[PDB]
A paper describes a structure:
[name]-1 polymerase is a multidomain enzyme and is one key component of the phage replisome. The N-terminal Prim/Pol and HBD domains are responsible for DNA polymerization and de novo primer synthesis activities of [name]-1 polymerase. Here, we report two crystal structures, showing that [name]-1 CTR adopts one unique hexameric ring-shaped conformation. Although the central helicase domain of [name]-1 CTR shares structural similarity with the superfamily III helicases, the folds of the Head and Tail domains are completely novel.
Two [name]-1 CTR structures were determined, one in A-form and another in B-form. The B-form crystals were grown in P213 space group; per asymmetric unit contains two [name]-1 CTR monomers. Via symmetry operation, B-form structure can also assemble into hexameric rings, which is virtually identical to the A-form structure. Owing to its higher resolution (2.4 Å), the B-form [name]-1 CTR structure was utilized in the following structural analysis. The ring-shaped [name]-1 CTR structure can be divided into three regions: Head, Body and Tail. The interior channel of the helicase ring is highly positive in charge. Although we failed to obtain the crystal of [name]-1 CTR complexed with nucleotides, we observed one well-defined phosphate group bound with the Walker A motif of the B-form structure. The phosphate group forms four strong H-bonds: one with the side chain NZ atom of Lys453 and the other three with the main chain N-atoms of Gly450, Lys453 and Gly454, respectively; the average distance is 2.8 Å. As showed by structural superposition, the phosphate group observed in the B-form [name]-1 CTR structure corresponds to the β-phosphate group of ADP in the E1 protein structure. Docking the ATP molecule from PAN ATPase into [name]-1 CTR structure suggested that Arg556 may interact with the γ-phosphate group of the bound nucleotides.
Numbering used by the authors:
A (entry chain B): 470 to 635
B (entry chain A): 303 to 718
C (entry chain B): 305 to 718
The structure:
Amino acid sequence: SNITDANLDSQFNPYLYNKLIVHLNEVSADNRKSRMLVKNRLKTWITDETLYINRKNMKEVEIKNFCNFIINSNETIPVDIEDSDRRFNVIECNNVLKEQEWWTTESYQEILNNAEGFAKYLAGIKVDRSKVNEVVMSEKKKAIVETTESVLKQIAKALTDRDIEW
Amino acid sequence: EEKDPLWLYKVLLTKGIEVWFDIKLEKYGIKRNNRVDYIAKSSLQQIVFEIIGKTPKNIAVPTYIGAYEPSKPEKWEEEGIKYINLFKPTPLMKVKPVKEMPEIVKNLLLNLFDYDAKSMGLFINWLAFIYQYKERTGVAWIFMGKQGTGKGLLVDLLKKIFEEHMSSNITDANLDSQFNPYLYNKLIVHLNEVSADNRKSRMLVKNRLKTWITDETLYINRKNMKEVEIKNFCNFIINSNETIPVDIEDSDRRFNVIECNNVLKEQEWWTTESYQEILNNAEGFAKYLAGIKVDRSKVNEVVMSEKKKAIVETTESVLKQIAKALTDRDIEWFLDNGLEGVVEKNIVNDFQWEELQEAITTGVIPNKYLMIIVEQILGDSKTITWIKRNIITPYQVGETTVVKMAGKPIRAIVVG
Amino acid sequence: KDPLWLYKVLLTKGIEVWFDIKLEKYGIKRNNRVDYIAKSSLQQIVFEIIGKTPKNIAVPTYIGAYEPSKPEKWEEEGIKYINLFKPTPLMKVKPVKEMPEIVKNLLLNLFDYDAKSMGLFINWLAFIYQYKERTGVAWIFMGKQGTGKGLLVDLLKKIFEEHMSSNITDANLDSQFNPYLYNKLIVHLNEVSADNRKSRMLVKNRLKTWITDETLYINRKNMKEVEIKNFCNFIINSNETIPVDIEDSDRRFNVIECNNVLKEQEWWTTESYQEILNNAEGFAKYLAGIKVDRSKVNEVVMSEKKKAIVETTESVLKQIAKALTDRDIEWFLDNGLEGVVEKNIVNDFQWEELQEAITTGVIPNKYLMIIVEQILGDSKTITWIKRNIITPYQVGETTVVKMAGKPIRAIVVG
Ligand SMILES: [Hg+2]
Ligand SMILES: [Hg+2]
Ligand SMILES: [Hg+2]
């Protein structure tokens, strides 16, 4: 829980050792150079079959990677995303919980007291293994792609596609 | 005192465990099922106690030097120095050849190579040489283009064949370490990007990557172990999604560059199970590689593909391109790069325009036209000093001197 | 009774073991490999050979020193030394008067059939082969790829073996460790740094001292940092336009540029490469028979490519400062100063007085500013010119001079 750029800049890798879910609270700062310095390392954490784990006063070890990543962010562009990207689904909500019909003072704790109920629900899902690795080009992901990619690539592809409308 | 200094070695061999002391690492080697670990004396005493029930104060095992040599026996002697081999074939390298590839694996390589049979075959030949001869080739293959073309799948599938002899998914992070375990006793090294997507990062790594591909030996430094020199058996496969993954010189001998934009999901033959079918045909692909008739002349062959040409011309200096255009009196290169704009801006009249072109073609360029030419190509005015220091002198285009044209003495650069 | 009983017994089996007080490790030498190991590691070797682990190690105490001129062991002040230099086979070889024909074709191609510079390199190599000392002069082979630079490296590598470091690059240099310099007669660099202004300058001073320093500080992993005498000689291969920065007065570098591709030659065949490497002993015999001219070992030549590197590398401000100092009007005209006339910054009379200021070494401030602006391409103030050209290079003094009637401010060169 709540791994951030600070943990990433450490020389150690505990938060990845023997994990099924890793949650990042921001991957880096919201500037062009921070997103690009971390872009390739996050790319491989999601898909590499193994990871090199290095912990304090322990031998550096290679292990199979079981990690799955959930990234929370309050920034406008949390990560760099390529057009052909296969790894990221992007969900943007602007529905503040406090501002909802059903939200109460006890609501937060009721949500956490229904972990077992939610766990029972997931245990009964008929998992479609075809859709597990499906990613969607949402309108916010499309916005991140066109913000992130090089303008020179956008010009080059407009010429290539003879895209006068572009 | 002891009658047989090899008694413990012998007893462990009966039970399928080979133990020695490696003078070069000052650690104890232990081999079981062709996996070898190097452990301290205290850890070896613990292993021994579990097996024979006694902890011997003295370790009755031979002293060998560990050497990774695929061509040599399990143990051998050179001069008076006894060696033990650290290379052990994996299951899928000891496999009966077949003449044809699994159909789905061939659809993947055909997708990667965009149905170009020539370059696919050259890569198969390169792979087949590594599988059968187990030597360093001095040639690396770069697979680039958009995501989802199957680059990682091919890596995963070779990784099931080679196993421990291959390093998977090495990144800039591993390279920025002071350690290089990913190079120790490896036949294939796979890199996911070599550096950041900018000019200076590519250049800082250019010579490091160049020597990893061709050095006969490497200095290996691993955590908590002596720094050791070893023979280099690495061959490099580089995956990248960037436009220019590495710097490449024109005369390059090391890089083959393959670009696919065929996304697997967008293909007629792709199914949901296809991904898992590809990985379950590792043995099928290995049997295919085992039967390839390797053409050893072509193993170190590199081709100048069009994407390779694009990287080279993006990589080299604009100043060197101008210098070679002067040297070759290549008026066509200058007009290809827009030198005719000089007339459209009336910097030069049509008579002067004739002398400017002819100055280039004859290799005798008056200073006034030199500056005009350079300003038009580079977009800002350069002094003669700047043109001499950055184009004429470093590339030895010619000499700056006084020449006589009709009567007048004129300052010019004479190409030669 | 005999504190050397184990030493003697290990010699029987072809193993020489000593304790190195300077490294506080145990040396063990077999067949020109020397390893330095811990006491527990030597006890393990000893147990396998003699069947007992002795609590006390009956070995001599020596200091390990790499000295090619000295015997296997020697004494100085009663301090016993052991030699870490041990000749390779191809250094123990019978001289001959001529080199193998195909090896001479390789060197002829590298040196573009220039017998003068080729011979100076052979003499340089022969001195290293025969005397095994540091020369203080490095050789840079540059030009197109495929001229045979690596082939010459590979062939000396067979000759020198362990006393040579092959294919050291900027990556090794940025390491905190220094193995490639420990106990070496030849070190070969494949590029010293990237081909940019800042990379060449950051490494310029470290390469300067490696060639000429009498000692080096060697630091290896899990070993004490040690000072040793430096026997290194450097061969630098490069495909870059400017491989290193070179000063005008430089004394260390010879620069050889060949553009003769081996594949494109009359005599090159498919077997040629391996024939070249199979004539190591022939080339070694040739060097063994050279009458080395010790006067020329440290001679460097100002080749046209080295001259090109010098003028590319050095500061333009130094070039201007020395042109003023030498009143070198021709230098200024070669660098386009007459553009001042064609742009009407100066009329025909002033143009004469400006040139006259340069040859006379008395330059009015007004003409100083014009000259500097035309050469550098941007307008400079008098203060900037004094702080960045006149003062740091001691071109001259700013003073009032009388020119025609008027008292005028000028820089007097001297
Ligand atoms: Hg993980
Ligand atoms: Hg390697
Ligand atoms: Hg040295």
